[model samples]
Target: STGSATTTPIDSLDDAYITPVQIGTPAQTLNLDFDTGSSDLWVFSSETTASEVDGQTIYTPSKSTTAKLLSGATWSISYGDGSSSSGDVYTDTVSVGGLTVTGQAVESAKKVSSSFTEDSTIDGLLGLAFSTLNTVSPTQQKTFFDNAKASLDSPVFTADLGYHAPGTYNFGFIDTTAYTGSITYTAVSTKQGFWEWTSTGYAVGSGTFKSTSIDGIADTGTTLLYLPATVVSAYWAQVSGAKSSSSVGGYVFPCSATLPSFTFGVGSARIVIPGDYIDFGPISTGSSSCFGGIQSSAGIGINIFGDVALKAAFVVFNGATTPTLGFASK
Candidate 1:
């Protein structure tokens, strides 16, 4: 079986992407963020605290005849931003696009943080990371991708994110028409329960490619691309009036500055991010100072190849016993 779904960016910054998912017997449709950084298919639900439920949609498992409570099964996940959500688990018939999975574990949130409440774009999140990262106690549950992979034509899924437009997530098979060149494959390190890999090197604009290996994860859940300070500082140095500001909390520069493109190596292939994508947006509405899409990963612990970089290429998450990642220009 295969599934295809359209994912839409939530804001101009492309802070996150959301796709509609159908859950339960009668089919309760909820827009969810397909996050590859975490492993917990959690959602805002009827059980979520009233104060935490803002304008987002809620899943009411009671309304579904097929929904069954997973006795004693509970889960909680805290993000890098310190925001978190926790809930009870249930099994139900869940469908994304045309693919369906019966008895899929669905975590119904009992409480959510202020960050989740303030963002009304996504009702919840569907984790695409390894099942080993799942927070469920006693019996860890598999992700939607894991459960559905066995039935798919190929045990793989692809992410095709667009800039300021709708993108597609394809499961089972790769769409030959979606990319422009041959895919470059690399081994994935799943020991950390993330889609982690090492980049051969990087080049700032037309500069020479640095011969250094940078380890990072392909995280769709994160918004920006973060690299080591050496690479980040070099890129910003070329831009006039760009500086790291404690007040603004990131590398910011004049809005009119001509930003240089960023290129990172995957195996022998180089994926180039257009200059325009690096111009994240104005620091605030109508402000002349703009935050950069690429920032230093020093404080973040691990370099993150998030949406900013992912949107520049077509990525395939191969879920075979020996997992691998594929990248191609789109």
Candidate 2:
């Protein structure tokens, strides 16, 4: 039911992760990773000469009547993961779900790598994560939300996930039936491209750590929940029974035992991340058995919410209506 005609996969990993919805009437979809980390919607084009574009799906402007290439415009995007892509500019009719919007600005990469080309199932990325990372000018760049706003009931977006399972991420209207009460709202900051906040402290298990006050950004692009060294150490100190293991060059705990429930207070909103979210994937020496949710990002200035935090609630980015964030239940 999720994969419809307009929602064809640009790219997908095991049918779980997918990119943007394909555009056009009888639209051909591309598998694209929707990233909140940066803003920009780019696709591999058949015109690209890069060797890495070998196996990837490329959009051809000549084939689609709705497609248009922006001349004299070049674009490049670099991720925190150290991956980057560059290309020329284009515009076309972009469709998602059943909604079709015309003259949508898009990037057609002239160069791409195996990281992008290797994915046989995906075509490109649809960045609904944030408008702050958008490469298009406010007057030029048209996001999916920008087009679908009029059709939506509340002009809100919702992301829902199952525990250790693939979740449904939807946009357009905010489904009040899916949530219990009024939505909680957070104002967006103009300083950085990320949604940042200040937390009073953290609670581990049943114990509370009041010594450290934390401040960081919430990012959906990242995978693991990163914390300051002080918060990580304080958490581990309380969970002495849980073994610490390493993966991704970081420590994780794999204890199946009922782990502690941690809560971070942001003003009136208290975000609770269960212990299971803290447990890493597997248990091994220097490789596993480490906490999943809490990891040390000593030098990484901002803290990312990752999937752990995002899964717990329904988040909405209302950039068109107001530059604010609204949070509700999953």
Candidate 3:
């Protein structure tokens, strides 16, 4: 059978997308963020300090008959957003939707970063990056998708991230019903354990599209779009009261300010980001200034096409062939 699954949104269109998965023998159900940024199937569990966990659910491997500790195996990951987690590795059968993957690496977290603990909702992360990025010590581990690919009708998956609405993730085959028009394909490289690709250029509002190239990662876990300083400033500058403030974390503008549509050149098609999506909501304790969802990639080496950007288009993270990304207007 062609394995498939559809994920649910855990927050407004902007926070994160989570899916349910069954781990171990009798099966312990846990919600996991399907992150395309990093690789590691980890969860809050009995191993995690009780104080470190908030409202998040924990996995209990000791109660599962199929759970087995991998000798000397461990994993840890620090996200760019400051959230991180680490724990011991356990091999067990994991199932998503109706499909089951045996011997999947399940990291039971011993610790979680403040960012994650504050969320109080997410149980853990199901990394979608190349299996090579797996953090399992001594030996690398394969991701759920990597193990299920060969048996799938087609080695591909499609991301239908919606705006303030629910979206679906299709595996093995592209769900034509999930998108419209034709998918514009762009080449991507997995050299850095990511779906790394370059944009021919971009433009803010009705401005002319710049020919300058921008290399970035198509990260589902990230919440905003990050470009270079010049580009970010150029985009936000279009607004009347936009300013770059350290205290605000990035660029902030008047909440009532009119935002222009930002467009990026991708191969033969241009994906446009609506102005409204650029307004990332208020900053500070209670300030009238709202953060611009688009920002500089200064500290972060690669630009991130996070939920803000991805949701505007139907993205097919095609694993078939050399691995190309297909995008189309929703």
Candidate 4:
């Protein structure tokens, strides 16, 4: 039977959507973020320094009868947010929502950077990106979906994300009931290890759609939508109080500004992001200043269609061979 995992947003953190993943013989579970941005299934572990870990649950490889250490192999990865984690590798049974996949590579953290050490919510990351991005040393490793796909009938995963609510990450099968209207598909290029696709064009508010070809990745791990600096500037122009601040890094505006509608074209389909949703979160608590949810992807190298954008649509990440992204209104 096809399997699915329930994804719930952790209230305090406004960004990530997480799910419980069980690992090892004794079924140790960790709350994991299903990140499409990078490829690595890592968890907080016994090797992690006590001071480095907050209140996260850790996995003890020695305690699990089925866990086997992949000696000499190690992994270290960093994010755009500057958070990082490193660890040794182990082969163990890892499952989400009780659907099991044996012999999966689980990177057990020995050390985590300052950003990760203080974040008590996320136990680890469950990467859904193409296996080409896996960071294991000496030899690369396959992701959970990649390993599980060989034994499944049809290799497919669907992400149904919500702005501030619960959603489902379905594997092996698609649930037609989760969305309405026919799915509009766009060919994806995974040679880059990302669900990268080209958009016909985009429009801001009531403006006419411009015929601009744009390439970007659909990343569920990211908190905000990012576009080219000019596109971001164009949107910023519409806000009266908008201005760039080196201190804040991105564009900021007063909370009282009225945001306009933003639309991205996918082939013949047009997905529109509501103005209010584009406001993101406040820049700081008790302050009316807020950062734009759709910021510039200046130094990031790749434009990202993050959760702020993906949450507005039901996304389908197709099989290992010919990957395609199918989108529909939820």
Best by lDDT: 1
Model 4 C-alpha lDDT per residue in residues 174-245, reported as the tens digit of each score: 898998887899999987889999877788888888878779998989988999888888888888989888
Minimum summed lDDT over a 10-residue window in model 4 is located at: 8-17
Between the candidate structures 1 and 3, which one is better when assessed by lDDT?
1
Q: 1-330 in candidate 2: lDDT tens per residue? A: 112221222322112245456654346566666655566778888767767775666787677877776767677777665667777777777766555667777788777665666665656766664455666532346566655567665565555544465555566666566555566777666477666655656777777546455666656556567888777777766665553444345554445455677776554666677777665555444543544566777757677766666666666666554566666654
Whole-model lDDT, candidate 4? 0.87
For model 1, residues 1-330, the per-residue Cα lDDT tens digits are 899999999998788999999999899999999999999989999999999999999999999999999999999899976899998999999999899999999999999999999999999999999999999987999999999998999999999999999999999999999999899999899999999999999999999998789999999999999999999999999899999998988899999998999999999999999988899889999999999999999998999999999999999999999999999998
Report every candidate's CA lDDT. 0.94, 0.62, 0.86, 0.87
Candidate 3 regions with alpha-carbon error over 4 angstroms: none
* C-alpha positional error of residue 18 in candidate 2 after TM-score superposition, expressed in Å: 2.2
Off by over 4 Å in 4: none
Backbone collisions counted per model: 0, 27, 0, 0
Root-mean-square deviation of candidate 4: 1.4
Report the error of model 1 at residue 137, Å: 1.0
